[PDB]
């Protein structure tokens, strides 16, 4: 909303003004990389035990 201040003429009279608006989100992400090693696959699975 916006306030007013009255005035004398001959200024044309001013009326209350209401501002409406909406905003829109913007989308993002993050990234990281975990990589294992080959043999580490064997051991965890148990294949090399």
């Amino acid at each position: 909303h916006q306030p007013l201040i009255a005035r004398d003429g001959p200024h044309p009279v001013e009326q209350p003004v209401h501002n409406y608006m909406t905003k829109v989100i913007d989308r993002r992400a993050l990234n990281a990389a975990f990589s294992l090693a080959t043999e580490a696959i064997a051991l965890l699975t148990g294949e090399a035990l």
């Binding site: 829109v24 989100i25 913007d26 989308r27 992400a29 990234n31």
Partner: protein
């Protein structure tokens, strides 16, 4: 494997329907990466190239066939990697040529006749997926038309494929768009046939190679050499350094003009002939 292409927000009602219209159409993405922006796909990212420029840039970039198109992101499955992972992806014809079963399919820049997103202010030029026997003919016709426009014929404007008439004419933009190919094809021949003309009379050395040469040139090449030298003449010419710059140039145009397939079409429980406008079940892995 599948990559995502994020649509930036602020899409109108027809432009969001415009990405819905191009369901299974080809997209080149620069690097295989999980997140990727839609500016990288667009025609603005190619800087603007002519049809010699786009054939270079379709050899550096990585083609992906668009699968399901979500309102927030475009999902793309690349051909070199995830198509060895995912077996069959649908792909939509845009060509005027019906794809038969088991055709090696290449993609060609749209020389014949292009979705522009007005809210985003970028254009998306897609290639035209037509098979490799036509792809080697249509480019070879359009280069050969460009030479007869450098002084046409009653023929050469008409192709027949699968019983159907093709029309390359449907033009003055096309002949100037494809012009930097023509200036390379004319250069790569006329520099070639003069080095042959400057080295066979230079050596003609007889071990058996000249016996292989002149017998194969017996009224075939030496008469072609003499009829060229009749329309010619017979300091030290910089000959041996002109070989290098030609072989580096001649071997380069063979890779632009190769137009190698990516796609093979193994249809199953469907028509053997995929029409124009329809989708074709598409694989690249044996």
């Amino acid at each position: 494997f599948e990559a995502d292409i994020a649509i930036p927000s602020g899409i109108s009602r027809p432009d969001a329907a415009a990405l819905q219209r191009c369901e299974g159409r080809v997209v080149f993405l620069p690097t295989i990466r999980r997140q990727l922006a839609l500016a990288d796909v667009a025609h603005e990212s190619f800087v603007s190239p002519d049809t010699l420029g786009l054939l270079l840039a379709y050899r550096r970039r990585f083609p992906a066939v668009i699968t399901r198109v979500l309102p927030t992101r475009i999902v793309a499955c690349p051909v070199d990697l995830g198509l060895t992972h995912a077996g069959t992806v649908n792909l939509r014809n845009t060509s005027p040529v019906d794809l038969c079963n088991g055709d090696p399919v290449s993609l060609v820049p749209p020389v014949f006749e292009d979705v522009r997103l007005e809210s985003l202010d970028l254009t998306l030029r897609f290639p035209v997926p037509l098979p490799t026997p036509l792809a080697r003919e249509i480019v070879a016709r359009l280069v050969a038309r460009g030479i007869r426009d450098l002084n046409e014929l009653p023929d050469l404007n008409v192709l027949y494929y699968n019983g159907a008439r093709l029309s390359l004419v449907a033009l003055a933009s096309v002949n100037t768009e494809l012009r930097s190919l023509v200036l390379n094809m004319v250069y790569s021949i006329t520099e070639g046939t003069t080095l042959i003309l400057t080295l066979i009379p230079r050596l003609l050395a007889l071990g058996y190679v000249n016996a292989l040469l002149q017998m194969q040139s017996v009224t075939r090449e030496a008469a072609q050499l003499i009829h060229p030298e009749a329309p010619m003449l017979m300091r030290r010419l910089p000959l041996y350094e002109a070989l290098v710059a030609w072989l580096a140039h001649a071997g380069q145009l063979g890779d632009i003009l190769a137009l190698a397939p990516a796609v093979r079409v193994c249809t199953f429980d469907g028509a053997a002939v995929v029409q124009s406008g329809d989708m074709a079940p598409v694989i690249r892995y044996p």
